[PDB]
Design a protein around this ligand. Structure first.
Ligand SMILES: C[S@@+](CC[C@H](N)C(=O)[O-])C[C@H]1O[C@@H](n2cnc3c(N)ncnc32)[C@H](O)[C@@H]1O
Length: 279
């Protein structure tokens, strides 16, 4: 549903990789009472950076020129890439006008306005502005209903052999896409799944609730405009294997048969690497 992602429709807007449960850590208190306990904010930021370390595991940024972030949040991913790699040109789309304002300000404050452009545009309806070597979607695609249009937009603006990296959910069997649904989206848009890391255990550790029942409910009443009661369902689903949080590494393959992309992608979807076994 809508309680799957860090935010529904360093300022990262994703869950993080917690190798283990941290006693006392509350993502809810950390996000909505951030002044009260500083160590929580820092632990969460480290975990969101660890998510990104794994997401980028195979990417050689020295080799890439152009980057598209199709749901760019507050622009932190574009800013970090731009600051650390002076040759990159980067574009971001967000459907939020407020986020676009923040992104533009943060880009200019970092002196990156000559290399990063931000647009308030819809990645399923508005063509990306250029051709890209690297496309980022970290907790974005699941929020976009018209995934066929999104993946056509990705394909049409990705150079052959270009890379798509995503953080998103897999339904292991209605809302999140199953393996077969993801495979249809990739295979019908010239995309091969190269490698995927399953961080479900570690995202669940991030979501672990340290407040006992009555205390948690009292906290959520003081906070009153979200509904925090449903996040327990996401935690239970990740613990039980009903859904997985997956870090996808995908390559554009313009010259392969679509049925053979599907055949190879299905095999790769059976080879997901748990983060605990990743190195
Ligand atoms: C959970 S936030 C993640 C933001 C960023 N990727 C990050 O990791 O911090 C989801 C982002 O997707 C954007 N988004 C949702 N639907 C979109 C759409 N159709 N087109 C462009 N952006 C979209 C939101 O505006 C928001 O910026």
């Amino acid at each position: 549903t809508e309680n799957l992602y860090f935010q529904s429709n360093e300022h990262f807007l994703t869950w993080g990789v917690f190798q283990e449960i941290v006693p006392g850590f509350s993502w809810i208190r950390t996000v909505f009472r951030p002044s009260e306990r500083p160590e929580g904010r820092e632990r969460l930021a480290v975990a969101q950076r660890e998510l990104r370390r794994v997401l980028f595991r195979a990417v050689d940024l020295s080799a890439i020129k152009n980057v598209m972030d199709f749901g760019c949040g507050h622009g932190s991913d574009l800013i970090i890439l731009g600051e650390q790699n002076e040759h990159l040109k980067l574009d971001g789309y967000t459907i939020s006008g407020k986020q676009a304002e923040v992104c533009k300000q943060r880009v200019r404050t970092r002196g990156l306005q000559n290399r990063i452009r931000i647009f308030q545009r819809d990645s399923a309806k508005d063509d990306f502005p250029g051709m890209y070597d690297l496309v980022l979607g970290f907790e974005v695609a699941g929020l976009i209903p018209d995934k066929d249009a999104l993946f056509s937009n990705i394909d049409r603006h990705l150079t052959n052999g270009g890379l798509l990296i995503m953080a998103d959910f897999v339904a292991n069997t209605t809302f999140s896409s199953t393996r077969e649904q993801w495979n249809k989206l990739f295979s019908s848009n010239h995309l091969r799944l190269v490698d995927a890391v399953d961080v479900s255990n570690e995202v669940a550790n991030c979501l672990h609730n340290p407040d006992y029942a009555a205390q948690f409910e009292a906290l959520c009443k003081e906070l009153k405009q979200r509904s925090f009661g449903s996040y327990e369902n996401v935690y239970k689903a990740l613990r039980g294997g009903l859904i997985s949080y997956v870090l996808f590494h995908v390559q554009k393959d313009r010259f392969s048969r679509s049925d053979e992309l599907f055949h190879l992608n299905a095999k790769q979807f059976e080879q997901l690497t748990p983060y605990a076994e990743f190195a």
